[PDB]
Design goal:
This is part of a larger assembly, with 1 copy of chain A (187 residues), 2 copies of chain B, 1 copy of chain D (50 residues) and 2 copies of chain E. By secondary structure, chain D is an all-alpha fold. In chain D, 86% of the residues lie in helices and 0% in strands. Chain D is elongated, with a radius of gyration of 19 Å. In chain E, helix 4 (221-239) crosses helix 5. Chain F: F-type ATPases have 2 components, CF(1) - the catalytic core - and CF(0) - the membrane proton channel. CF(1) has five subunits: alpha(3), beta(3), gamma(1), delta(1), epsilon(1). CF(0) has three main subunits: a, b and c.
């Protein structure tokens, strides 16, 4: 069964690819090869960026696919069928979209989570580590489900910090506390 | 003083804990946001946008949960986080809302200091069943003679005020509120009505004048004024009748009897129209979403006369529907007509004709209730209706150059006087005890002879005369509420005495 | 983007699995979704327009729309026992009634 | 009573704008830095209680 | 139980879509129950949209639902309780005792859906039903096992008309009755519950000769649609399985039409003419066809219809106009004339009026009446401008007779002793034919016009003539 | 750092920009795209997310190359205000369109602002005399009020207003704002000249009027935010200068109409008769930011160009909600030749009351309404049969009403040029007397022709002598 539905469109494509290759039990290989073909698509810069946008036939599109699978042997067989589908649907524009989505599904299979501790300033490494530790200590990180912690700088939340991951947040920024303080003193 | 209060307010801010659920705004604008996340989420929940905006949630989609803002767009921005309030929409409800103007949320917009609320309630509450009801046995008389006699209003009952916009449309309702001062001044809780005037879609200036008028007639001291001014959000406007309703339910629950004016209910429909069209629901007839009927029906059926077991607490309703073009064939008026228990059509032509009230009695009915009026007044106005109906028929016949016979002109002459008798100036409620005499005189044709011009003079003077001599008689009408033989005779003699002089 | 039964995940997963066609879309059909008495069938490539088709629910239908990705059958009976993935045999006979 | 009440409100909004001035005073400081350390340890206390 | 579990995917009003898991997909027209602190929310499966997602319609308010909420499937169309243990209690949309009569059901339940009996099943009828209401008896006689149809507009005292029928006909009839209210007020509800307790039809001691199924307008549009089906199945159980004569009463079928129109839009069906559902004809048809007197019991249905703003050209009344056997129009004008019954005589057509069915005499009397009334209406314009001048003396006598007849049709209702005060008259059908015959002959042209007004039979008319004479 | 973007789309005058950096836009911000035609000002109106705004563009969008550099100027468009607004006619941005060079300003204020609070409201009703008999008699205006006109298609919608400007605003000393949304340019130049001539604009001196003028040529989007610009100028006078203002708006139908144009392009499923589904909110915002508050009393005058001459259309309908007086003027009464063309049974004011204009005025008005209502009632009979076939008692009423109808036409001073008939400004005190006399039938004894197009009752008498010759 799906590793929890991602989007409705394009991630239905990813979901299908995923569940089909999950039952083939060859997801890491598929993902890696998809990364590799994605890399050689990107590293074909003219007409591997500028022929992601349709402008040519079904038959000509198919021959672009054929050149792509000529570029490296092996690409699973499920992602070789995925290329067929995309050629038939004449949409390579959402190819890297599917790649990213398949990546999300893949790293969901890994259980590798991504988080963020948004601040309005670059944060200490001690804070990064202590929070990563804290998050692992808590059941917020599943354990078997990994974590990345990304500080981003956003002046938006003036000072403070907000820890974010999953659908669980704790927001102890200064801007938000000020918002409530101001508001309560607007009474 | 002010320092101590401020110190209390700051002191009342302190600490917090981990906020469950988040989601990031994406597309947003119009007043309708769509956020990604919020996997757990109750429907109709209130969700706090990090901008400061609070928004109810009307669409839960397997994509992007659609949270309708109750605040300005400008505050909101892309990728903001929203953290769920965790409460389905709810209102503070209490006694303190008496003597308060409050906005939809329930904050005083007259700023007479924060409300004293005895509870909170939920904005969507389903109508009381068949089981908790009693049949309407308690009149509520508006003090407008045409209304009391012709379209009797009883507690519980939903009675629809319908007619062309702001042709004193508000004023008809305000008169009712003013006559409910008479009971208010009095005693016995169940013989008192508290009054909730709900103002949706009206300009701040009209509303401000209205609250001023209520303070002027010193009828502000038992009113709740729920307001959603014209500027205010279409979502807040949609929510506004339903949050008024809950405040009313607090009375209903208390066993208290009260009356809720939903003016204009028509503006709720406009609000729901907007709301739906920016939630991109398929638009119904005339672009009002089809479940507008459902919306209005669920709202209106919450007012009821409860069972004796359930404390009798009668919330009474008066919807007010603006009739654009005066054609009720429009989808929203048609819908409302079915829902309501009576219709009180007002006609513009009759306003111009100088019948003020301008209520067209041919189109006005109270389809249920007749123990919704005073027994005395029922007896006297027994043939008031018949005479008026005959007057209407005869007058119709008279048109197009038909030379009337004397018998028809007896009716016509009698009929004309009744019409003059009905008229009442805006903001001039009357006491029912002194409306019974006036109708007695008219129906017993004592005014038929009296010259058309000086009918108003007769009315004024007659009342003065009854105040002078037969003030004993008036006291009895108040006390017994059905005319006895003695009263009928006394009244007959008195009326006869005043025909000349 | 375009709506085609390549969107339909069960169809799509099979296509990815290198399983397709082959007397599934001959005359042979399979319901994708049935709502409103308007079954939308993937297959029936041999269908003649407005032709009578017999479901495995047994309901008979006609095919007014030969949409480029589905054949929009109109069911002549209730949806009570009609549900997704129904095999749809193609009766192969244009609307005809006994005459005599 | 009316003017007295009006004056209580007027005083409150005047002293309100002084709170805004105090907010501007707070946000300049490298308390802007030092209280972030406080938030850091506070979140440590919070998430460990989870 | 089968693990047919779906997680809600979209709460968008009444429409709630569910995502059942692979290989366990429900069937269209199944019934889903979702455990909630609101008891069990019932969702009726109404479409498959493929990909293991159904789009279902709610039977209860969709506020406070959770996106992803586990949904058990009880399968097939909602199964109500049936019996003679359904006699005398208020049964809600999903069947629950909304009068706290505790467990309802005899030994059986039946589905809300049922198929309409086939052509072969149909068995012709042509009986007679005397209502005592003079206008009905003379100018449009009903027939037992019929499909009587009370077309009228808003607030034609629609309930009041029906109440008179219940007061007389129901108590009189041995057959069970079912009073089903689709989208009617709880004000009306409390009155009806009380009133029929009083008339004893609902005997709270012994068995009630009537059941109640009150569906009210406060119930969601989805629930409003399936109030009708529930009531219908109770009637079917009586009709078929108990074999009994039934005397069904349903209210108001515009609410059924309207309800279907509303959820049509929500179901995503592109609106048809005057915003009604494109499935209007067939949805009506399924209800109407289901109700019929076959080889099994005789359902004597009286079906209320609300004609929005008295516009009969509107498709919703007009479509219903065909489907009912014995149409009656209760017009505003006639109400305004003060005539209660408000029946508009020239606009009330019945297939049961014939010179064979009720015989030549009945027919002939009524034919003369119809012509007379039509003459009066045609002449009204002449009277308006020309007046009594170049209008015949003979015509004038006919006009005078028509005014007498118009008010001879006026006779009070017993259930309008509270909506009037004069007690109604159940005047024997044969007696009415005779009494009206007398009028036409002009045998009572010495009787005041107002001495025909709001009184019973000829004996009463004479008595009121004497009363007025004094 | 510069919130640069490229123009992803240019779908009509609803350009969409795609901001590169993840620095956020904000709704109702303003953006400057520098063009070799000078800058173009756009206003962020939707966020479509993923750093793609969709922006209303005030001025024309011709020439734009898809992928055009943007810079975000931040926040709504800022007008320039001061006393220097007075005696200047300004573009939406605020640049002098009368080319009177740089407008020195103190405060530059955002076009958008929030409606003042319910608490701040203050209500009053000081009877303003217009010197127009029909206005005074039927529905007198009052200070701070919101006055309303529902003039038909080119019924001299502007002309009615011009007479009002000529009378009331030269009798007003405080500040006054003229805002003309999508008005015909040539008429605007005439107005500008007339104002300069009548010294209301004195370019050498100071002007007690300021003006914002929006040509009917101008692109729809500009016209949409012309109102908000003017509304700010009014607020500056109301608030910052404190002085009692006046405001004239013509046509607020253009405000609605413009909105209807943009909405579809914006991405909205439109409501009936094509009207924007945001009609109620937009109208609401505009009309609640115009109000008499403790800060200042702003008498406002709003003109509605009734579209297709149907007043049941949703745009007129929502206007009726937000006014304290209305004086619907209709094409039919214009066709009858009655100038002014105000419908006398379709005028109302909350300022007509027996406790306002006194019992005598109210009584006078009652009779006027009754007579006219009768007169309208007998229009059928009058046509079908002869007027002699009318009942004799009624025939007197009809004759009186026929006179009343003619009497109500009063020559106007700005119309005096066009009609050729010298204008008449009749005192309010005079008006009550004049109609009172007619109601007592005193001067009902002389022709309808005498009553037609003349001033006061005395003038009718003199005109009877003239007519007699």
């Amino acid at each position: 069964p799906p590793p929890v539905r991602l989007f409705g469109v394009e991630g239905t494509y990813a979901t299908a690819l995923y569940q089909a290759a999950a039952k083939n039990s060859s997801i890491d290989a598929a993902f890696q090869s998809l990364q590799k073909v994605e890399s050689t698509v990107k590293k074909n810069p003219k007409l591997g960026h500028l022929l992601l946008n349709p402008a040519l036939s079904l038959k000509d599109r198919n021959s672009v696919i054929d050149a792509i699978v000529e570029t490296h042997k092996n690409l699973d067989g499920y992602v070789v069928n995925l290329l067929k589908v995309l050629s038939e649907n004449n949409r390579l524009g959402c190819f890297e979209k599917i790649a990213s989505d398949f990546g999300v599904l893949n790293d969901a299979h890994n259980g590798l989570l991504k988080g963020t501790v948004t601040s309005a300033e670059p944060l200490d490494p001690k804070s990064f580590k202590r929070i990563e530790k804290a998050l692992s200590a808590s059941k917020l990180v599943g354990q078997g489900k990994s974590l990345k912690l990304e500080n981003v700088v956003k002046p938006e939340i003036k000072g403070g910090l907000i820890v974010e991951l999953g659908d669980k947040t704790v927001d102890l920024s200064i801007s938000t506390k000020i918002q409530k303080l101001n508001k309560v003193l607007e009474d | 003083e002010v320092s101590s209060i401020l110190e209390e307010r700051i002191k009342g801010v302190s600490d917090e804990a981990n906020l469950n659920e988040t989601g990031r705004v994406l597309a947003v604008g119009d007043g309708i946001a769509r956020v990604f996340g919020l996997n757990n989420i109750q429907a109709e929940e209130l969700v706090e946008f990090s901008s400061g905006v609070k928004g109810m949630a009307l669409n839960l989609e397997p994509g992007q949960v659609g949270i309708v803002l109750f605040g300005s767009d400008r505050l909101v921005k892309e990728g903001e986080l929203v953290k769920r309030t965790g409460n389905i929409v709810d209102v503070p409800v209490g006694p303190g809302l008496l003597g308060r103007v409050v906005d939809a949320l329930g904050n005083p917009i007259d700023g007479k200091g924060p409300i004293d609320a005895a509870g909170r309630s939920r904005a969507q509450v389903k109508a009381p069943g068949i089981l908790p009801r009693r049949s309407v046995h308690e009149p509520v008389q508006t003090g407008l003679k045409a209304v009391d006699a012709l379209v009797p209003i009883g507690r519980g009952q939903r009675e629809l005020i319908i007619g062309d916009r702001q042709t004193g449309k508000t004023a008809v309702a305000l008169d009712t509120i003013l006559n409910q001062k008479r009971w208010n001044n009095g005693s016995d809780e169940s013989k008192k009505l508290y009054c909730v005037y709900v103002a949706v879609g009206q300009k701040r200036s009209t509303v401000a004048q209205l609250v001023q008028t209520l303070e002027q007639h010193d009828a502000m001291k038992y009113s709740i004024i729920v307001a959603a001014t014209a500027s205010e959000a279409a979502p807040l406007q949609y929510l506004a009748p339903f949050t008024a309703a809950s405040i009313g339910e607090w009375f209903r629950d208390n066993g208290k009897h009260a009356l809720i004016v939903y003016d204009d209910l028509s503006k709720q429909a406009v609000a729901y129209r907007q709301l739906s069209l920016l939630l991109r629901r398929p638009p119904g007839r005339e672009a009002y979403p089809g479940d507008v009927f459902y919306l209005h029906s669920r709202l209106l059926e919450r007012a009821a006369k409860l069972s004796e077991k359930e404390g009798s607490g009668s919330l009474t309703a008066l919807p007010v529907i603006e009739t654009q073009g005066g054609d009720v064939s429009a989808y929203i008026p048609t819908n409302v007509i079915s829902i309501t228990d009576g219709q009180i059509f007002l006609e513009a032509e009759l306003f111009y004709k100088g019948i003020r009230p301008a209520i067209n009695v041919g189109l006005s009915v109270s389809r249920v209730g007749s123990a919704a009026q005073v027994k005395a007044l029922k007896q006297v106005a027994g043939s008031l209706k018949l005479f008026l109906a005959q007057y209407r028929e005869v007058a119709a016949f008279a048109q197009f150059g038909s030379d009337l016979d004397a018998s028809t002109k007896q009716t016509l002459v009698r009929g004309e006087r009744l019409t003059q008798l009905l008229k009442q100036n805006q903001y001039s409620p009357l006491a029912t005890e002194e409306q019974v005499p006036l109708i007695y005189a008219g129906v017993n044709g004592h005014l038929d002879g009296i010259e058309l011009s000086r009918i108003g003079e007769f009315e004024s003077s007659f009342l003065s005369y009854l105040k002078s001599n037969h003030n004993e008689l008036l006291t009895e009408i108040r006390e017994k509420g059905e005319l006895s033989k003695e009263l009928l005779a006394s009244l007959k003699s008195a009326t006869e005495s005043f025909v000349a002089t | 983007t375009k709506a085609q039964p390549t969107e339909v995940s069960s169809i799509l997963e099979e296509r990815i699995k290198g399983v397709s066609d082959e007397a599934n879309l001959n005359e042979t059909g399979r319901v994708l979704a049935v709502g409103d008495g308007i079954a939308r069938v993937f297959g029936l490539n041999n269908i003649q327009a407005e032709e009578l088709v017999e479901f495995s629910s047994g309901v008979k239908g006609m095919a007014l729309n030969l949409e480029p990705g589905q054949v929009g059958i109109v069911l002549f009976g209730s949806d009570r026992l009609v549900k997704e993935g129904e095999l749809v045999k193609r009766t192969g006979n244009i609307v005809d009634v006994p005459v005599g | 009573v009316r003017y007295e009440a009006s004056l209580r409100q007027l005083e409150q909004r005047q002293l309100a704008k002084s709170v805004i001035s105090r907010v501007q005073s707070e946000l300049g400081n490298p308390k802007f830095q030092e209280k972030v350390l406080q938030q850091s340890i506070s979140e440590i206390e919070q998430l460990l209680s989870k | 139980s089968t693990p047919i579990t779906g997680k809600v995917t979209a709460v968008i009003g009444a429409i709630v879509d569910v995502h059942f898991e692979q290989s366990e997909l429900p069937a269209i027209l199944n019934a889903l129950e979702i455990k909630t602190p609101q008891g069990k929310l019932v969702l009726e499966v109404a479409q498959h949209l493929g990909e293991n997602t159904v789009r279902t319609i709610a039977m209860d308010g969709t506020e406070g639902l959770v996106r992803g909420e586990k949904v058990l499937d009880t399968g097939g169309p909602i199964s109500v309780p049936v019996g003679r243990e359904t006699l005398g209690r208020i049964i809600n949309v999903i069947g629950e005792p909304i009068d706290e009569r505790g467990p309802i059901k005899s030994k059986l339940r039946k589905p809300i859906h049922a198929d309409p009996p086939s052509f072969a099943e149909q068995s012709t009828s042509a009986e007679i039903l005397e209502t005592g209401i003079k206008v009905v008896d003379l100018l449009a006689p009903y027939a037992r096992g019929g499909k009587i149809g009370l077309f009228g507009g808003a607030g034609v005292g629609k309930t009041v008309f029906i109440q008179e029928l219940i007061n007389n006909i129901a108590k009189a009839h041995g057959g069970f009755s079912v009073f089903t209210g689709v989208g009617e007020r709880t004000r009306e509800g409390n009155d009806l519950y009380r009133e029929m307790k009083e008339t004893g039809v609902i005997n709270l001691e012994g068995e009630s000769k009537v059941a109640l199924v009150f569906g009210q307008m406060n119930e969601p549009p989805g629930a409003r649609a399936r109030v009708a089906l529930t009531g219908l199945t109770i009637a079917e159980y009586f009709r078929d399985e108990e074999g009994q004569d039934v005397l069904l009463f349903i209210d108001n079928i515009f609410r059924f039409t309207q309800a279907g129109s509303e959820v049509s839009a929500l179901l995503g069906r592109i609106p048809s003419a005057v915003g009604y559902q494109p499935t209007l004809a067939t949805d009506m048809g399924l209800l109407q066809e289901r109700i019929t007197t076959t080889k099994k019991g005789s359902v004597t249905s009286v079906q209320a219809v609300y004609v929005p703003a008295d516009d009969l050209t509107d498709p919703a009344p007009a479509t219903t106009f065909a489907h009912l056997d014995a149409t009656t129009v209760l017009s505003r004008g006639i109400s305004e004339l003060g005539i209660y019954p408000a029946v508009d005589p020239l606009d009330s057509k019945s297939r049961l009026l014939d010179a064979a069915v009720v015989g030549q005499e009945h027919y002939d009397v009524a034919s003369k009446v119809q012509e007379t009334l039509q003459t009066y209406k045609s002449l009204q314009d002449i009277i308006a401008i020309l007046g009594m001048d170049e209008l015949s003396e003979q015509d004038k006598l006919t006009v005078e007779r028509a005014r007498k007849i118009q008010r001879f049709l006026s006779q009070p209702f017993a259930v309008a002793e509270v909506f009037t005060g004069i007690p109604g008259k159940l005047v024997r059908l044969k007696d009415t034919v005779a009494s009206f015959k007398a009028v036409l002959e002009g045998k009572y042209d010495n009787i005041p016009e107002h001495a025909f007004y709001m009184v019973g039979g000829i004996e009463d008319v004479v008595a009121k003539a004497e009363k007025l004479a004094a």
